């Protein structure tokens, strides 16, 4: 359901790089953990109470990290080791996770790096990222650290930032050019906005030319977009952008398209 697509509708060159995912162990563990967390009605009431009172003074993201709630899921360890095509014990030097959220998505990729680096707009997410021992860098500081990153993860951020196309060329410049790989998640249908305080939002200062009338077409528009910033798709899959749920629903799902981009 979340993992399949009409392989005919894809572009012929995308047909050769697609990877099939399945509802495996780790996804069930997350789903079963989420169903358990929602079952605790006392927490949900406390969560749905704190967020309601401070929603005007903070962002929906910052409140989540303040509570450690609403953690999300993209790929399982095996799902990640099948898209990147790495063995369970694969390991390189540096990771960079841009807009890493509360880090429960970065923690899946963490066993493969000696150094993890993360950026986040939310002040409580930075605290959550430092709680995972990650070196949290500024949003304009990572491109100037004086060293390159072997894997730069940009998961579900282009539809959430002000200058996404700038971020793409930024990643291209600091990615280790010989063997570095970029992993990039994206919610389709592509609906971008910049989150603001008090449930508000603003349109981004850079428009991405990601168009389509379904999942397969919006994916087909992405190869040329990655070609702009100097990337080519090495592999990609369809995954659910799973998120922890409230008292109303045990979990939430969004349609994610993850890409492994080698620099060209």
């Amino acid at each position: 359901q979340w993992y399949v697509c009409n392989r005919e509708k894809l572009c012929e060159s995308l047909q050769a790089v697609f990877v099939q995912s399945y509802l495996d162990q780790g996804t069930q563990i997350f789903l079963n953990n989420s169903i358990e967390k929602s079952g605790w009605a006392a927490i949900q009431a406390y969560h749905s109470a704190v967020s309601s009172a401070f929603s005007l003074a903070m962002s929906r993201t910052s409140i989540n990290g303040l509570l450690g709630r609403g953690s999300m899921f993209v790929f399982s360890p095996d799902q990640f080791q099948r898209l990147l095509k790495i063995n369970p014990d694969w390991k390189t030097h540096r990771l960079l996770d841009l807009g890493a959220g509360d880090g429960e998505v970065t923690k899946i990729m963490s066993p493969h790096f000696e150094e993890i680096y993360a950026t986040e707009l939310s002040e409580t997410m930075i605290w959550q990222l430092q709680k995972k021992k990650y070196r949290v860098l500024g949003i304009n500081e990572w491109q100037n650290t004086g060293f390159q990153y072997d894997v730069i993860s940009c998961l579900n951020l282009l539809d959430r930032c002000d200058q996404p196309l700038t971020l793409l060329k930024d990643i291209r410049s600091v990615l280790e050019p010989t063997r570095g790989r970029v992993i990039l998640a994206l919610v389709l249908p592509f609906h971008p906005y910049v989150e603001n305080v008090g449930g508000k939002w603003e349109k981004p200062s850079e428009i991405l030319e990601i168009k389509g009338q379904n999942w397969e077409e919006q994916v087909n528009s992405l190869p040329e977009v990655f070609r702009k910033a100097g990337f080519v798709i090495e592999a990609f899959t369809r995954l659910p952008y799973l998120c922890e749920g409230d008292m109303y629903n045990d979990y939430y799902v969004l349609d994610d398209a993850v890409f492994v981009l080698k620099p060209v």
Partner: peptide
């Protein structure tokens, strides 16, 4: 209470 992505 919503999905934590908007």
């Amino acid at each position: 209470h919503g999905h934590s992505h908007g």
